[PDB]
């Protein structure tokens, strides 16, 4: 053990269908995150449940497949009247009811306050090892959507911070407060930057 | 398909007694195979209501290895797209009945429909699952009646001016999504057998 550093010098499966998303991943955890990570296509279920039961689940049949350390992603956008939903099923109702309506959904409340969740889930492939999960928060309010409409559900979130919606923000703005940016911070601290 | 599962065990995946009794009464005493109740330990997968009910089905058949029957049951807002549908579950235990309704709020349109899927394999690896659905048209209401009744007590049928959870017993069976799923899996198998 330990669990980080028997990974070092190895190769990590990042679940991923393009080049460009492993890029973004790279340059985050930086020069000296000590593994190797390659993007691959793998098919896995989606699973009902809560945030972070599902990430690990995910990870579990990762490993199933891939039976070597493996990487995962899950982004979950949370509004608090809702008790944290639509949370991990946030692609159906964007899916279905665009920005706009995701905003519509809480006109029954007088709480707007949300936030977005990142969580990477990690597993060497085993012996007997535990999924581990590295998370980020980022919290805002559901607003009428602001910006260009074809960037997912950030026209209608604005984090605090700020008067701008993550659409409207320029993309290194948005980074500083990125829910995404502060899961792979903790990605990079279990790791430690001693070891490359 | 159902020639073949006449006169054997289909494994009918739910947690107790009752649950098999209320199906095994509805199919009634000429459906010719024999229901048997066991608890399957099964993931809960996003989709669409088909997808799921097949990425289960097929789970059940993966531990089984033999005949398996499973069912979900979805609660779709039109004016949502169909959606929580079969995320219900979580709505319901986040925003209680009132909450769901609740969510509308904005909407003009409050039709909505129940839905009912029960999913059937054979367990042959060749053979694909068959899907039998039922629906209910109706509306999403400020609830009324019992609470203790799921989404009940949000959910007006179309024919009746009482939700779900305000009707008896007998009424709610006869515009029931359920036995309307159960109908198209007794028609499946015809009464020519038993």
Redesign the interface.
Known sequence: GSMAASLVGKKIVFVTGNAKKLEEVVQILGDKFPCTLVAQKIDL?????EPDEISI?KCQEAVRQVQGPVLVEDTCLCFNA????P???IK??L???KPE?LH??????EDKSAYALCTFALSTGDPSQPVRLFRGRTSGRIVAPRGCQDFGWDPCFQPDGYEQTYAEMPKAEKNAVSHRFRALLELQEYFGSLAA
Do not use: M, T
């Open positions: 279920p989606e699973y009902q449940g689940q809702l008790g944290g939903l949370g991990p099923y159906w109702f899916e279905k009811l309506g519509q959904l809480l006109a029954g409340f």
